[PDB]
Design a protein around this motif. Structure first.
Motif, short mmCIF file in Angstrom:
data_model
loop_
_atom_site.label_atom_id
_atom_site.label_comp_id
_atom_site.label_asym_id
_atom_site.label_seq_id
_atom_site.Cartn_x
_atom_site.Cartn_y
_atom_site.Cartn_z
N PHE A 1 0.72 -1.19 -0.11
CA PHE A 1 -0.13 -0.09 0.19
C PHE A 1 0.69 1.32 0.21
N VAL A 2 0.46 2.10 -0.85
CA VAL A 2 1.07 3.48 -0.96
C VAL A 2 0.23 4.74 -0.61
N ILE A 3 0.75 5.46 0.38
CA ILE A 3 -0.27 6.66 0.81
C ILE A 3 0.20 7.69 -0.17
N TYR A 4 -0.81 8.36 -0.74
CA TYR A 4 -0.27 9.64 -1.70
C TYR A 4 -0.60 10.80 -0.89
N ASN A 5 0.60 11.74 -0.81
CA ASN A 5 0.31 13.15 -0.21
C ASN A 5 0.33 14.04 -1.33
N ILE A 6 -0.69 14.78 -1.43
CA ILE A 6 -0.79 15.71 -2.67
C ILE A 6 -1.90 16.88 -2.17
N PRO A 7 -1.66 17.76 -1.00
CA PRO A 7 -2.34 18.78 -0.43
C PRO A 7 -2.81 19.57 -1.31
N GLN A 8 -1.89 20.08 -2.16
CA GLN A 8 -2.25 21.02 -3.45
C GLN A 8 -3.81 20.83 -3.79
N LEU A 9 -4.01 19.58 -4.37
CA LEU A 9 -5.26 18.85 -4.99
C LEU A 9 -6.27 18.42 -4.01
N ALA A 10 -5.81 17.49 -3.05
CA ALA A 10 -6.85 16.91 -2.19
C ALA A 10 -7.34 17.82 -0.95
N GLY A 11 -6.79 18.85 -0.62
CA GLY A 11 -7.07 20.03 0.16
C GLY A 11 -6.64 19.56 1.71
N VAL A 12 -6.02 18.25 1.72
CA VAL A 12 -5.60 17.83 3.09
C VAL A 12 -4.22 17.18 2.86
N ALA A 13 -3.41 17.24 4.00
CA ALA A 13 -2.20 16.54 3.82
C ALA A 13 -1.76 15.35 4.85
N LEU A 14 -0.97 14.56 4.38
CA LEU A 14 -0.63 13.50 5.37
C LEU A 14 0.41 14.15 6.23
N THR A 15 -0.17 14.45 7.50
CA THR A 15 0.64 14.83 8.69
C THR A 15 1.79 13.72 9.11
N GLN A 16 2.96 13.96 9.87
CA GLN A 16 3.72 13.12 10.56
C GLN A 16 2.66 12.22 11.55
N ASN A 17 1.77 12.71 12.21
CA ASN A 17 1.04 12.06 13.18
C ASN A 17 0.19 10.95 12.32
N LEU A 18 -0.43 11.37 11.13
CA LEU A 18 -1.19 10.40 10.42
C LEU A 18 -0.19 9.45 9.85
N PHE A 19 0.87 9.55 9.42
CA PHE A 19 1.90 8.89 8.86
C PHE A 19 2.20 7.53 9.83
N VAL A 20 2.50 8.18 11.03
CA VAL A 20 2.83 7.19 12.24
C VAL A 20 1.59 6.05 12.55
N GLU A 21 0.28 6.73 12.37
CA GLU A 21 -0.66 5.90 12.46
C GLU A 21 -0.92 4.74 11.43
N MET A 22 -0.44 5.26 10.17
CA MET A 22 -0.63 4.34 8.96
C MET A 22 0.26 3.37 9.01
N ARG A 23 1.59 3.76 9.69
CA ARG A 23 2.61 2.69 9.58
C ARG A 23 2.55 1.60 10.58
N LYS A 24 1.16 1.81 11.27
CA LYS A 24 0.61 0.42 12.14
C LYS A 24 0.18 -0.79 11.08
N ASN A 25 -0.45 -0.31 9.93
CA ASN A 25 -0.83 -1.15 8.99
C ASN A 25 0.48 -1.78 8.19
N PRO A 26 0.65 -3.15 8.52
CA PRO A 26 1.96 -3.72 7.76
C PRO A 26 1.71 -3.54 6.13
N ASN A 27 0.95 -3.53 5.64
CA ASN A 27 0.71 -3.41 3.98
C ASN A 27 1.24 -2.05 3.66
N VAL A 28 1.38 -1.05 4.38
CA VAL A 28 2.00 0.13 3.86
C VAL A 28 3.49 0.38 3.87
N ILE A 29 3.91 0.56 2.42
CA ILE A 29 5.40 0.46 2.24
C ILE A 29 5.92 1.82 1.98
N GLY A 30 5.19 2.94 2.26
CA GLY A 30 5.65 4.01 2.26
C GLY A 30 4.51 5.28 1.62
#
Ligand SMILES: CC(=O)N[C@@H]([C@@H](O)[C@H](O)[C@H](O)CO)[C@@H](O)CC(=O)C(=O)O
Ligand SMILES: CC(=O)N[C@@H]([C@@H](O)[C@H](O)[C@H](O)CO)[C@@H](O)CC(=O)C(=O)O
Ligand SMILES: CC(=O)N[C@@H]([C@@H](O)[C@H](O)[C@H](O)CO)[C@@H](O)CC(=O)C(=O)O
Ligand SMILES: CC(=O)N[C@@H]([C@@H](O)[C@H](O)[C@H](O)CO)[C@@H](O)CC(=O)C(=O)O
Lengths: 304, 304, 304, 304
Positions: free
Chosen positions: B135-164
């Motif tokens: 699984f790949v998280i896409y960080n595109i705040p310019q278009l999505a209007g929301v950003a991947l924060t450091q805290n949201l990334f720490v939270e997502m790293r709990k999912n073992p399928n997340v590769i980056g």
């Protein structure tokens, strides 16, 4: 041009799902009956408040069909027909004209920031799919990421179906500038519920809001005080409505999830939950749901 | 964890249409054959560059099926599966796992600015619909209007399928912070094409771009100079690629419309046009198309 | 045009105070002696890092005088002369030329968002008050609220004293675009310390930073690895410097208050506190000061 | 707490320079006499409209001294005392108390985005330098780059000298939220001139504007229609004032340069020009200056 049927309170119509999360025809009809009985000017169907972003073209057709079965001839009907792509938006604009809605509405293209000429082409392609229906342009830069500029508005006024702008941006100056520029044959609808009275007095003859459905009588009464020039009574209702909005927005669950839950408590309405990714209510939110529902009852007792 | 198959140049795959504006299976196959011949690390399918926003779930299935039908070779396939709602995204994540893609990717929820917990729920619900796929998280705040924060990334790293993370935000510090925080078992993909060299040296081992498809060899050569530590030659290719980007972006027609037209001139590829609301090319754009195609040929001659 | 004296590491010079909060001539001299001993290319005097915003014209004259009094050695001196109004900036630009500084620098007008022609007039009026001195445009949109656009830069390049841009905006593309547009007779300075390596490789031959003074040797070593094309070792120093930045920024007291305190621990330097409204250190900050000072010592031991 | 003396129209006082660009005592007195004769509630001295950013502490003392010589006992006096650093702001707050001004006002710290505790410390340090004078907090996020949050406002309400907020941000919801939170012992002043009527009805009992000085009678009349609940007459004046604002803002020269020029035409006032970096008027602007001055005369004839 006569735009009297668009002047007044037009609540944005919520998404009505059965217990599985599918569009409920029975549910939609019941919420329309609620709006008919509450005596609002009309309904704004399949907007952001109606979770349009998360619906299929078929979901959106079913909603409008069931809204029309109950509201046709009784309420003013504005159907939001904008979809991610143009062909889906044209299909919905055509379908809406077939049901004889008063007006069609469209937000700008989203996600990508498209140039002004691409936005105008998108809206005119939608309008051309419903060539006999009135057209409302939605200015919502906070969410769409693009704003309706004065130049884009001048360009859109070349389309005779365009009757005005539904302004959801925060500056009331935007309402004032759109109105002054367009003149008497155009209508500006007030989008920020928390600024209803401020938008109305500076030139918005219309009002479309996502929180209206939770307390229609409060907004009708607010609008009544505005029209009478009773500003102190208007201010007092405004502050009471905003106090309820801030409470509905303090929940973990989405504001619309809170509203549907309130309509169960105050009206016995079964509207279903919110479609994912919108966050559902949690157990902790029930107290917030009950307190806000009571704040509504108490504000009606105090101001009606 | 071994992420070697994701390191290198992964062009974002364009939306291949027939002359009627429908997904071209033949077209898709031909563009996949192109990327195989160009020797790129893989393809990023049904992303923003693949006009995902404007496609149906069925359109997106056809694209991936025809990519896989040809990606028999050495193409690491990353399929972007995110849709406006969660159920459409789950359907695509399931479908992708069925075709055995290397990874699935997702942009955040769009239009509404959803809280962090709703974003995490959205991504994990997608990941759960493909429980054996990377699984790949896409960080595109310019278009999505929301950003991947450091805290949201720490939270997502709990999912073992997340590769980056595929980082499309402009600060390279975002790549540095995501990389430093995640460590060696994670990969950061460089999103801004114009900053390729800058993103790569600060820690992005991957690269996904919308302009790669127009000049794959230039980026491969750029990446080769980077790896070798040839900064002066890297700079020279970077500036030549950016000079081509700015030219492709000076057209009235959408950048992707320009690219498809270039691929017709330089590679005899028939990719169709861009789906509305994306603006099509105009007569005046033909010169920009011709000039940028020549700039590509001239840059290949000068740097390969 | 020869700009070799501006290439390399140029730490932004801190505001050296006595125990009463007044400019310390002795303090200034001691910090200049420090930079000479550290072997840095030069010093950027009376910038944002030198708390220019909070100084009087006289305070800023004293700082530069005492820097020059010691910068007998190999210190390329860039004096930031921009003040809220033009006449104060002209007085400082004249004063700086009288001391024979290598270059003068200016941020744009602040607070109000002035049109491009007013910004160009401001900078040229400053440059005309020092007609024989080199001129640096400072691009810092995050703080100034206005950005140096490509058009404003084309306009400024008509002034022969303009030698380039000090770019503090986050996109490295800004460095690339300014460099490509200006060519070989211009220099771009890297502003974001956390992106030093990324800014340098895409075209910044210069570097000005507010955190350089806290660990000059780390940046010199970083720059040495960059020049050598040792990207892996550069990355390792970059991440160690950023790890120290984030720690210095986690304090209640202002980052510059933290730095001065570190220089007391690591170099026995007496620089005073930070001028109000900048927040001073609190008791809880002492541990962050002690830990970041140790992180500096440990990083020097590991990389030098 | 009685705040009646702050309710009504309080024009922001312009910078009055002699022919060389120095603060003109005679000029200041003449503009104060103009305001006394026009019958406004008071004057807001040395604000952004008074070009405070570009003045010295001495310049700002002279302005207030000459304002007091003429307005003491006749008009309500609010002196803006905020400077780049704290010690300059304290000196001005002390000086203002010595002249017996009704209130002191302060914008937040500018340029750097200082944490909430640093902003509160700055304001309380100013307030402590005038411990017997009322205190107005300025919320101007567009220019200051930091906003007065609800939490910072709760924190500031602990200071008994704080009488309210002068809100220059565009959302009227900000006025509503500040008012509802503070209650009856606090006053909110309306900052955006173009939204005067909208800010007033939602809860702003005060009004401070930079365009009031150009047409005081129009705003007084506007305020009179608001208080009477005559909203149609209010709307008509609002639109006429905004039409004049947009004209004054279409010039090459700064809006304040245009206003001073208008006051020469309509009142024979000699106010000098605008201090650099503010752009002066050009020859082409004279027609704009004359048309706007005539629009003022014509609007007074139509509405008074
Ligand atoms: C930003 C936003 O969603 N604005 C809403 C408001 O009515 C909103 O629900 C309300 O002001 C509460 O914040 C509407 O203007 C939009 C809306 O209801 C719709 O398009 O369906
Ligand atoms: C904001 C944006 O669209 N950025 C691009 C970049 O690859 C590139 O800079 C852009 O395509 C051209 O400038 C990609 O990250 C997006 C992309 O390829 C995708 O999601 O399909
Ligand atoms: C926004 C900002 O202040 N950026 C800094 C950077 O050097 C650095 O990233 C910052 O000092 C620490 O993060 C400098 O460009 C500013 C500076 O040193 C100056 O103008 O004196
Ligand atoms: C953003 C801004 O400058 N706002 C002004 C307005 O009065 C402004 O002049 C007016 O609305 C015209 O745009 C005031 O709120 C501020 C002001 O006059 C002052 O602080 O001196």
């Amino acid at each position: 041009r006569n735009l009297e049927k668009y002047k007044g309170v037009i609540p944005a119509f919520y998404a009505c799902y059965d217990k599985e999360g599918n569009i409920s025809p029975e549910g939609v009809q019941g919420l329309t009956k609620y709006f008919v009985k509450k005596g609002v000017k009309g309904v704004y169907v399949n907007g952001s408040s109606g979770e349009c972003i998360y619906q299929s073209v078929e979901d959106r057709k079913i909603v409008l069909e069931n809204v029309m079965k109950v509201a046709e001839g009784k309420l003013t009907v504005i159907a939001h027909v904008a979809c991610n792509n143009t062909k889906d938006s044209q299909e919905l604009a055509r379908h809406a004209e077939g049901l004889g809605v008063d007006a069609i509405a469209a937000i700008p293209p989203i996600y990508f920031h498209l140039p002004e000429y691409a936005i105008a082409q998108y809206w005119n392609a939608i309008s051309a799919a419903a060539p006999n229906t009135d057209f409302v342009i939605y200015n919502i830069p906070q969410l769409a990421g693009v704003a309706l500029t004065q130049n884009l508005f001048v360009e859109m006024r070349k389309n005779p179906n365009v009757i005005g702008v539904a302004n959801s941006s925060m500056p009331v100056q935007d309402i004032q500038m759109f109105k002054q520029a367009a003149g008497a044959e155009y209508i500006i609808f007030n989008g920020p519920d928390e600024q209803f009275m401020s938008g109305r007095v500076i030139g918005a003859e219309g009002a479309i809001g996502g929180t209206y459905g939770a307390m229609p009588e409060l907004y009708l009464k607010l609008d009544e005080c505005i029209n009478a020039g009773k500003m102190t009574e208007a201010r007092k209702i405004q502050y009471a409505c905003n106090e309820i909005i801030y409470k509905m927005c303090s929940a973990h669950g989405n504001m619309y999830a809170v509203i549907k839950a309130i309509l169960k408590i105050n009206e016995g309405l079964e509207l279903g939950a919110v479609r994912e990714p919108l966050p559902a209510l949690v157990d902790e939110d029930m107290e917030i749901v009950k307190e806000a529902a009571q704040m509504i009852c108490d504000a009606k007792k105090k101001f009606l």
